[PDB]
Ligand binder design. Sequence first.
Ligand code: HEM
Length: 116
Amino acid sequence: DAMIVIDGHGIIQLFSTAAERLFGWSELEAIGQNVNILMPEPDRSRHDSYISRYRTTSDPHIIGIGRIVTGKRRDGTTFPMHLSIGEMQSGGEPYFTGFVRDLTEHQQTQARLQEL
Ligand code: HEM
């Protein structure tokens, strides 16, 4: 699905077309913004520390592990998504890449089956 690339400060560098469809923000709008704009509180207010923490401690909590989290669209609606984060480097600087898998349908089908 969506692909997002951020620098070591959480600023969006690349935003794929699928990402635009999934999150509602366009490439130009998202580029130059903190990745925290795609998530809700409390994570939103702590995400920077999350990244900050990893840069010194070097202890992966998600990198190479993957996790299902809640994403937030521009219109404020939240949805579940699987996220895998990869670490890379360019220009001697660190970059993080996130691969997103929308699980909205999976969750809806599950809730519906649970309801019937
Ligand atoms: C939109 C939803 C997202 C949410 C809610 C989210 C949530 C989190 C959480 C909970 C942590 C801390 C994990 C822990 O303390 O165990 C974390 C760490 C991190 N996130 Fe995200 N994140 C999101 C998107 C992204 C994206 C798109 C990127 C990068 C392209 C990113 C990069 C990072 C990095 C680099 C870390 C630290 C590395 C690590 O702990 O393994 N996150 N995130």
